[PDB]
Paper text:
TrkH, KtrB, and more distantly related KdpA belong to the superfamily of K+ transporters (SKTs) that are found in bacteria, fungi, and plants. TrkH or KtrB proteins assemble with their respective cytosolic partner proteins TrkA or KtrA to form a stable complex. To better understand the mechanism by which the Trk system functions, we determined the structures of TrkH-TrkA complex from V. parahaemalyticus in the presence of ADP (TrkHA-ADP), ATP (TrkHA-ATP), or ATPγS (TrkHA-ATPγS).
The structure of TrkHA-ATP was solved by cryo-electron microscopy (cryo-EM) to an overall resolution of 3.0 Å. The TrkHA protein was frozen to the cryo-EM grids in the presence of 10 mM ATP. Interestingly, TrkH is in a partially open conformation and the dimer interface is also different from that of TrkHA-ADP. First, in the presence of ATP, the N2-N2 interface is lost, and as a result, TrkA tetramer becomes two dimers. Second, the HN1 interface is no longer present. In the presence of ATP, the N2 domain has a rotation of 36° relative to the N1 domain when compared to the structure of a TrkA protomer in the presence of ADP. In the TrkHA-ATP structure, the tetramer-to-dimer conversion in TrkA moves the N1 domain almost 13 Å away from TrkH. In contrast, TrkH in the TrkHA-ATP is in a partially open state and the ion permeation pathway expands to more than 2.1 Å in radius below the selectivity filter. It seems that opening of the ion permeation pathway comes from an expansion of pore-lining helices and the movement of the intramembrane loop towards the intracellular side. In TrkHA-ATP, the neighboring D4M1 helices form an angle of 45°, while those of TrkHA-ADP is 59°.
Author numbering:
A (entry chain D): 1 to 28, 36 to 61, 68 to 90, 94 to 117, 123 to 153, 178 to 483
B (entry chain C): 1 to 29, 37 to 61, 68 to 91, 93 to 120, 124 to 153, 178 to 483
Write the structure that this text describes.
């Protein structure tokens, strides 16, 4: 099936991935250079005997097929077992805080991996239009420059030397919840960093596709204040979050001073809630239900045209508000229902497809919970772990045993696939399984 | 809003409910008689001053509302001496047909009435199940009577074969009419374990629980009965799921190598799997010879509950079937959105009208599920025991097996009231009280 074209294109892809492998070498390192050489060699052998050129789902799978391989070689010789080495590689990879447990070059590379993951996750994410020319690089390069320079200067304000500010900035690009120390923000708590970082968390997560027009000099920004459905819904949930935090604070009478109670409390609620992953609280001053509630909050993750693939506003919104239309259906079946919350008329093909996706998603959820518990994992610690795993924050808080090294490595391989599913569209592998497809 | 016409009909309804309140009075060795008199008095004061006569959802809510109005009065006063909230909870436990035990301990007359309550609940739930056509003449009362006579007589004679005196056979029969999971002793079959009863009862369980409205044609005399073998999908899907259940039981038996003899292992093992699975509620196993996942798996099995036209209202074959098969259509939609999908699993062409409602019902159901889990844990209940309890509660079997502490006398009584409403919600369509909360409705 035209294998000659596929070999050269795939080889070029592996070589291109390999070019971006000199990151630790800047910090005087050799295995990563070796990976570039081996894959480049692969590209070279693929490239020359075959010259001819010319499905798509196969390509997407091959895309993230690649991303998965690679990044596992320098760890078998960090002395850790091969399954654990692979698991750790994925742990560093995909911005998942999968801690079971370093060199200063490797650590820089790990934060760099977060950088690579962050840019990579949002580039083919709005490039699915042919299945459902490279000029977007510049406009993306400008927005990024604004994001990183702003973060670095913001860290600088505290007074740390630029290397430290840059180090923290690299750590927070694709937040997995990692920092210099295991405590996410407990080890260093300058007030300016906390306030500024929380602002970064709010601004950086929900929406950048909407502001793509910002590249054009039309000045369409003040229009978005009004009639933006996302803004009203999102503000209602977040403001409600603030009010409940305030109420909880008053009920327990935790901190009398405003600054610690508001910044620290707000920081914990926002950080855990926003799927950030920076957690430094054992939730003892909070009741037990707050960890459970927060975990449910963790499920709500990502925004439309955002870094994280999770349940979105429009999907839940459609179910609820469309659900309201269904409530109206319950009142009367003779009654035509057509309501358009959005400015456009909405076609009935997409809505049905979306909730169907949710139903299949539920099936996957059952598979993940049942499978992980089924493999030999404990009912509760794994239960919290699966909730956390699907979201991609970290270890399960309830009945804490954060580091699972002694769990079965084949299941660990399953954990890798599950977290990968957490980031990538889950049903790509699903298309592979079906018997009608063969 | 024409209140004079609601007063007489509702009063008549209360009096009618009261008419069948003489059940313990047959067993000498008064409060229930008092309930009949008080409600009859209520009907009387609502019948003579008003002579006039004349929405519908209010009436259905009201019918369900009537249950439990006079099901809790005789328990505050007297052998059952228990607190008022607990008395109400206990009343609902017996009445709801759920197995909500707070006590260990099972008056002969009161107990007879309790089993009788199971009889009342069993016929009552089925009768109004198909009477919802005006919103979505009483000639059915004899055709259901023949079928019911067949069911009760068959159960009694079946128990009689074992060799117990007819009173004991009838007692067990009354106990198994609507299946709470109760017997003379707390263990379902541990106290008496005769083999004929076990085999016959399992047959009873399989036949009784699915689907009897298909066999409503059994009353008019015709030959339609052989045709159903190839006629219905329900048989292929249901048989496939049950057979798979048998195979997994067989394979888990051979993996652990539990019992070498085939009589005990197949009947006891099969009995346990089917009984826990079929929303029956008869449980005598602590699941130690089974791994821990089997209790979890069984609880998931408990969620699958009811057949279309069956006594219990729980997720069904057609709903899940629609999601998966229609889901398959959805699966085929990722391949080409340009591709028209129209498929009819059933004999008729199926309309796109009802189908959105089914999954919408599931979505709303999930919302309710979140409310129940979050609310019960939120009230002050424990993490895990409550979690198993809510799964079990929605189904209406009994206690959560995992980390078992079935009896919860010391749990908060207002939440216990919430538990009562939750289990009732399991039995009746949850939404029937959801149309009250909406502000657009007022």
């Amino acid at each position: 099936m035209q294998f000659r074209s596929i070999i050269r294109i795939v080889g070029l892809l592996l070589a291109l991935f390999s070019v971006t492998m000199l990151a630790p070498a800047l910090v005087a390192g050799v295995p990563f250079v070796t990976t570039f050489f081996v894959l480049l060699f692969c590209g070279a052998m693929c490239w020359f005997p075959n010259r001819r050129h010319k499905d798509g789902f196969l390509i997407v799978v091959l895309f993230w097929t690649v991303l998965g391989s690679a990044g596992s070689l320098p760890f078998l010789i960090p002395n850790i077992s091969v399954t654990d080495a692979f698991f750790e590689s994925f742990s560093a990879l995909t911005t998942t805080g999968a801690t079971v447990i370093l060199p200063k070059a490797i650590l820089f590379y790990r934060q760099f991996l977060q950088w690579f993951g962050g840019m990579g996750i949002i580039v083919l994410a709005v490039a699915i239009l042919p299945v459902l020319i490279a000029e977007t690089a510049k406009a993306l390069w400008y927005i990024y420059l604004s994001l990183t320079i702003a973060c670095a200067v913001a860290f600088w304000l505290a007074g740390m030397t630029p290397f430290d500010a840059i180090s923290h900035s690299f750590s927070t690009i694709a937040i997995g919840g990692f920092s210099t120390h295991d405590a996410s923000m407990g080890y260093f708590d300058s007030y300016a960093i906390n306030l500024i970082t929380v602002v970064f968390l709010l601004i950086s997560a929900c929406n950048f596709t909407l502001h793509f027009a910002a590249f054009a000099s039309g000045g369409v920004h003040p229009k978005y204040y009004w009639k933006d459905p996302e803004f009203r819904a999102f503000i209602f949930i977040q403001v409600l979050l603030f009010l409940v935090c305030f109420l909880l604070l008053l009920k327990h009478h935790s901190y009398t001073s405003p600054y610690d109670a508001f910044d620290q409390a707000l920081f914990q609620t926002v950080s855990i809630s926003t799927t950030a992953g920076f957690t430094t609280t054992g939730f003892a001053d909070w009741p037990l239900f707050l960890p459970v509630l927060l975990l449910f909050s963790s499920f709500i993750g990502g925004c439309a045209g955002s870094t994280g693939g999770g349940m979105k506003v429009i999907r839940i919104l459609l179910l609820t508000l469309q659900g309201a239309r269904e409530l109206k259906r319950l009142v009367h079946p003779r009654a035509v229902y057509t309501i358009k919350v959005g400015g456009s008329a909405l076609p009935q093909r997409v809505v049905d497809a979306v909730w169907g996706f949710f139903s299949a998603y539920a099936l996957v959820f059952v598979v993940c919970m049942l499978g992980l518990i089924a493999t030999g994992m404990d009912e509760l610690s794994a239960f919290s772990a699966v909730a956390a795993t699907l979201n991609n924050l970290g270890p399960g808080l309830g009945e804490v045993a954060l580091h699972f090294g002694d769990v079965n490595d084949k299941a660990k391989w399953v954990l890798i696939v599950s977290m990968l599913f957490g980031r990538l569209e889950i049903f790509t592998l699903l298309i592979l399984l079906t018997p009608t497809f063969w």
